[PDB]
Structure formats: structure tokens, C-alpha cells
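Researcher: Next entry in the queue.
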Amino acid sequence: RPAFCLEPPYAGPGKARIIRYFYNAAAGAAQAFVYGGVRAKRNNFASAADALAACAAAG
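Model: Structure for this entry, 59 residues:
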């Protein structure tokens, strides 16, 4: 899987309150976090499905 999938979630310094998903490689599962709307890192998806397609795909 891409290295970015091993990144901890990055809420960032922003004041927005947006539910996003990261791939939690330790858990082997998608997980929700609160994203602040600025300076998103790559392990940051709109849905569990998008996180899993990026980070737990075949091949």
C-alpha cells in the first residue's frame, strides 16, 4: 500500500469541523477523525470506502 496510508490522521490547525476518514494501518480499518479544513495530508478521505480503496486495494 502507499506510504501515506501509514500516516497518523492530521486534523491540522484549521477551525472547520469536517468528518473525514483515515486508514488506520495498525487496526487494518478505516477510522473517522475531525479535519479542520486546512493543510490536509494524504491519509484523509471523504468516506471509509475511499480510504480503503486507496490503502487496502488488491495488487
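Model: Residues 1-59 form a domain with the Factor Xa Inhibitor fold (CATH 4.10.410.10).
Researcher: Noted, moving on.
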